[PDB]
From a paper:
The [name] protein [name] (in yeast; ATAD1 in mammals) extracts the tail-anchored (TA) membrane proteins that have failed to be correctly inserted into the ER membrane. TA proteins that escape this reaction are mistargeted to the mitochondrial outer membrane (MOM), necessitating their removal. This proofreading function is performed by [name]/ATAD1, which extracts the mistargeted TA proteins from the MOM to facilitate their subsequent proteasomal degradation. Here, we present a collection of three high-resolution [name] solution-state structures (an ATP hydrolysis-arrested [name] mutant and two conformational states of wildtype [name]) that address these outstanding questions and begin to explain how particular features, shared by AAAMC proteins adapt it to its particular roles in protein quality control and beyond. To obtain a homogeneous sample suitable for structural studies, we expressed the cytosolic domain of [name] lacking its 30 amino acid N-terminal membrane anchor (Δ30-[name]) from the thermophilic yeast [name].
Author numbering:
A (entry chain C): 44 to 65, 86 to 361
B (entry chain B): 44 to 65, 86 to 345
C (entry chain A): 48 to 65, 85 to 132, 145 to 220, 228 to 243, 252 to 355
D (entry chain D): 42 to 64, 87 to 356
E (entry chain E): 44 to 65, 86 to 342
F (entry chain F): 90 to 218, 230 to 244, 251 to 342
The structure:
């Protein structure tokens, strides 16, 4: 058992040496959680990349990140003016949610970690709660640490019964360290830990935990202006302006969500590429030139 | 296994000394339960700064927390006139059942130990029952003690058929050491140990545990006066805006929880604060 | 292990003498569970007007050990005083009252999960009379749990050694029917009747005065539903009420010193 | 409790050596899928054995299977001109939905990985997700990779909150690894992993899974020409008689699937051999007759 | 735990030793179905015993068993002349829909493996799919492999929106392992394993499973002479009293489906038996 | 074989049964056909095996009619009559707890039966026999070189909606009419065998007093008028 745990420890120590740069002491449980500390330089989508929703970026930055990072600015107010306990981005499926949980991990600089729901559920008994305590132990040892759990309605969410007698503890031993008797320091700082969460079913997330994460922003499907921005941003790397008429495309795709505009642009961005390939299919060898032309998709 | 256990017992010694002094020995096995003894001065809350709850904040101070400390003035009776062995603290989420426990831990005087859920369920076989036993063996060593299992719905609960019976042995261990044949003392005192619970749904905690906790304090949602008090109480750091009328936001809450009110009042203190972004501008 | 065997020797001497014989180290560790008869303060008189199941015990269990069936069950639900009955039996029993403390059987080893099970019956064979009462018997008698269960049921039916089995499960009809059928007897403990609830009123009300409240007789009018534990907690509350009033009055001024009246 | 690991780990390397030698190190749960990759030389069918699907075989080849391999060809706007992260083959049961994926596992070149729904659902707690992030970690190691979940509407479905919670995490684990936070690289390349899915019932898969896989190819029943071509493809094992209108069978079918036609051809072809057996002969005989019905 | 698995391995080894010669490695899943491979000599019924449905027993002996065993004579065809991978025989309750399975298991070398519904339904999550997979992993390892799912309309069935979780991924996994990715071999052989489905109503079995059982032999009620055939065959070694014949009873037995005749005749068989007790 | 050991709690022993064959109420023709064709061939088959492969006892026998105790009494009695250990279904055990727990029970029942002597299985209040249990109960009753040597009995008030395929496999379906104007005399004699019968009138109006009820009022009248002249003898 030690032969595997040593390599594990070496890997997480390497990851944390890469992250911490601009050497902790770790037990075995939150050791393997150190593999989930996302390096902020490995998420190539900032806040200037996601168009459409902008006010949600406003209320997501100037009330969550400025409270977490640079807390001295929010000390004149007192104990109230701190970062909220947790955040939730609920809305229709496939519009900016997981991609807005990337810019918050790239520019925030708050020791972001992706929780990886599988790791919460361990096979041995009493090791699915050791990891739930470890995710907060490591979160506070390198605070201010943002935590993220995508799809929070399976690992979290309404119990409705004693499922398996091991899923009611991760739902409870998470809530015990979240906003429990040790959530506040001896002076008042609540450890500076904000757990995000993405979900399209807000009404299945254990409303007792709904009190836990109050900053719950609705992430609606993009409107007409939001789509006119998402087309401009998704169609950056495309020699697409012979006689391009984006006003028609941003209007016709009204009912379409914000994640299908990407695939629509993809089909409308490799159509002339397929034309060039089928043209070159006559003879020769694939040594692709840079002369397709995007005009109109479907 | 021993060196790491030696570090565990060393940290346990430090925490126990800082709790006691405000000297004893252990078995090198129950040290991992004294690593949750909450100190008295670190909990920054008290019974004075919790508006709303009044009959609870008085009934706890008179009936449970303070027949325990200074029990000499209740020594006229036998088993009676003693600390009631058990408390529940049930209520909806976000109404001050954890803050109440924090204030109890800070203003009690008994050796408050915070028994987590991850400290009872153990991987090795037979290493989860001897921790539930270590808890009640430590509570009796120094026995002003308020054990506190927060969120008693997973660690405890209605024992159903099967469901990892090794996890049912823990609840059986609680049932047998809590009020079993050796519950009280040979002199008659019931060891002066009062577990404090916490939950949002009193429907599956237990029927064989409700008897084991005679007190059940219902903490409901704050009404008119409770919200009027909590709104004034939360605004102790944030300076009051000039001409700001409190009763409007006080009455407009109208049944909202005791934490959502805190968030809506935090927004009203960050609103102007966020607005003054001029320092970088200038 | 040396400290373990030393404490074992001391506790077993204080149990037996009211001598001692050295035995296996994996069998001494269960010998630290022998509570002396003078350790329990309560007695038979501390039980209410039950005097039927306690009478059955007094006639059928303690007498033969002075044949004695091996196995006795406590059937009542939580609230009637199963553990209280067991504690009272342990006082006026005169035999060797040895509990189990199932955590003692549970061990993080492979070949040691059966040695303690052997050691319990071995020590029972060493000294008589003996008592192996195990509260919450529907906890351990549900490759380790099954092994310990099978080995316990193997040596369960070990003069028939003067060994007695007493069970106090909080719930029945879902409890070890393989061995529950083997045990001879089982005594149900129902809710308190009229005379039973009257005795419960008269017993717990021992230290408090007779006029701290309305009256004792009227309390035995709605307490029919509640059990012996809810009645005791309500009595504790009603007793603390007058002392509550007195302490609240004394809060006005004066050092918080004890008194000699409510 | 250790020999099972040794057996799977030794066979895990041996299975990978086959696909590797056709042209690495894995942890515990990755050995499960390590015994699960399909070598393209093993499957005996190719793209030229699926008739009538000239508009689906051509769109499963220009936009989903050949932006993926040789991605250097698509590097002008590579951030967007990549292979889709999944494909949904849906339609009437019995036409190509498994044959297309069987030929894609043969004539693609990518490390095709079948998913085998029984292996995702372990009886222990948490192994169902340890296998999901094992397959979505082996695909990244065997990149480029192609995952195929035949009949996706069984292992995946609408959440249905009042059901088994342990099976709502594997359905909520694809939404975390297959398009989650780490679906992209440090520069934009989304791991070059496409997940194939063939369901006989679309719209009962999910409201969120139907956006991950952006290429839902509907595979209709064989029309007037699909039957004509499937007859040609199927009746190439035994010789044909000098005169029989094979158009007649296709011209009269008009309502059968791609499997019903194969079964009818099987029933028709057995007539001459069963007649030769009616002649009570023991040895073989290379002549027969494939007359209509 | 381990001892139970070792005992199951001992049973499977004994059963394979007794069934193979009129032995291969097995896990603890396909071992569970190892106890289901019946011995041909156990079933005391042959093809000659079945009557009435004489034109269904013929097409099963020429298009299923012959294309399954000794296919070298059928090797002249490439792949079309293999055995049909699935066979269904439906009928009203009271006809020969199960006795045909016995005749196929007894007088046709097939490694007949009947799987019971309780051998598929299980308590642990993902333990039923790993048995549906073990079945087809065993049938491949010994592959005459005539699998027989009687009352298939229950173990399978119509898949709905509000369908049970565990019972919904065992219908899809089964029909995916039947005709799926690994259905064929490297050489292109169809991997001969036939599945016998014997249901009472082919209306709700599935829309995708009926194609997986292309041979659907209808088993109607016993015909006029067919009932006479069953009468003459069921009372071969029975009582032989004077001239009174079942042919008159055959005309009398207009209804009284084929299963019912086997008890009608036995009830009529106590005529000389009852008087023997009169001593 | 954990389930067959679990079902071993309901295997009533073939001996020490309350059968007492004469105690059953007045029922001759049904019991005549029973003792002639079912229980008789169960014992000493060597004297009944003159014809082979067909003289096995059919495992289908139904007792349909209003609810009562005679059908259950007859089921209890036939076991001791043929030296059979009564293994009741215990239909409340058919409730579902796990996914396939009940199907395991249905398998283990026939497992123990085939492993056991010719005792007969009983299904009290047959109404459950539409999932895997209902499927597998029709399968393992008759399925894949010796007869079953065990008969299944049918006891249920429900008729013509009881899965007629199961009705097909129930050859000797016997109507069990509990209310009988002649069986009532015998059952009242059975009752009054021990009860003191000095003051009460002759057993003639009893044949018309409990005319409506089938077999329950007669069973409750064992002590209905028994203690009526008995309270005074007990109080004084
Ligand atoms: N507002 C947006 N601006 C730009 N791209 C978007 C936006 N919303 C969705 N997308 C596209 O959707 C893809 C990821 O979708 P995602 O936001 O993860 O869905 P969900 O909202 O369910 O998390 C990205 O590739 C991105 O291009
Ligand atoms: N009675 C109260 N007065 C003031 N604030 C309260 C009160 N109850 C709860 N809160 C606020 O709620 C937060 C913690 O709530 P918590 O005690 O966890 O709710 P619950 O006890 O219902 O779980 C604290 O930050 C505190 O400010
Ligand atoms: N028969 C009785 N008469 C009077 N009081 C009783 C009786 N039984 C129980 N009690 C009271 O109720 C309480 C029951 O507590 P306990 O014996 O621990 O319950 P249990 O035995 O169910 O664990 C005792 O403290 C005792 O004072
Ligand atoms: N376009 C086609 N050309 C040739 N054969 C086909 C075609 N479509 C289906 N088939 C036949 O169908 C059989 C497999 O059907 P499959 O596609 O697996 O059905 P499903 O889509 O329900 O999985 C193969 O044996 C093949 O001969
Ligand atoms: N021709 C026949 N000869 C002998 N037995 C028959 C014949 N037809 C039906 N049976 C009997 O009828 C019973 C029921 O038929 P079966 O095929 O099992 O239908 P099901 O599967 O619906 O029960 C069988 O057990 C069989 O013994
Ligand atoms: F598609 Be996202 F991850 F909800
Ligand atoms: F939020 Be408390 F701990 F219920
Ligand atoms: F109710 Be106690 F556990 F006997
Ligand atoms: F494989 Be098919 F789509 F059932
Ligand atoms: Mg709280
Ligand atoms: Mg007790
Ligand atoms: Mg398929």
């Amino acid at each position: 058992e030690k032969n595997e745990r040593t390599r594990i420890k070496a890997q997480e120590n390497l990851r944390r040496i890469r992250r911490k740069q601009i050497d902790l002491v770790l037990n075995e449980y939150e050791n393997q959680v150190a593999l989930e500390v996302v390096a902020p330089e490995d998420i190539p989508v900032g806040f200037n990349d996601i168009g459409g929703l902008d006010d949600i970026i406003e209320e997501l930055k100037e009330t969550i990140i400025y409270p977490l990072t640079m807390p001295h600015l929010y000390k004149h107010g007192g104990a109230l003016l701190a970062a909220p306990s947790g955040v939730l981005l609920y809305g229709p499926p496939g519009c900016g949610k997981t991609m807005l949980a990337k810019a918050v991990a790239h520019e925030s600089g708050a020791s972001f970690i992706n929780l990886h729901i599988s790791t919460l559920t361990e096979k041995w008994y009493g090791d699915s709660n050791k990891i739930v305590r470890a995710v907060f132990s490591l979160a506070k040892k390198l605070q201010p640490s943002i935590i993220f759990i995508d799809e929070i309605d399976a690992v979290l969410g309404t119990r409705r019964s004693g499922e398996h007698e091991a899923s009611g503890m991760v739902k409870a031993e998470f809530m015990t360290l979240w906003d429990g008797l040790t959530s506040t320091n001896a002076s008042g700082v609540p450890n500076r830990i904000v757990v995000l969460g993405a979900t399209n079913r807000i009404n299945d997330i254990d409303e007792a935990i709904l009190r836990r994460m109050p900053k719950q922003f609705p992430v609606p499907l993009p409107g007409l202006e939001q789509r006119r921005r998402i087309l401009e941003l998704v169609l950056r790397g495309t020699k697409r302006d012979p006689d391009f008429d984006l006003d028609y495309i941003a209007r016709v795709t009204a009912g379409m969500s914000g994640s299908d505009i990407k695939e629509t642009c993809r089909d409308a961005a490799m159509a002339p590429m397929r034309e060039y390939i089928r043209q070159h299919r006559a003879s020769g060898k694939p040594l692709s030139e840079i002369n397709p032309d995007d005009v109109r998709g479907i």
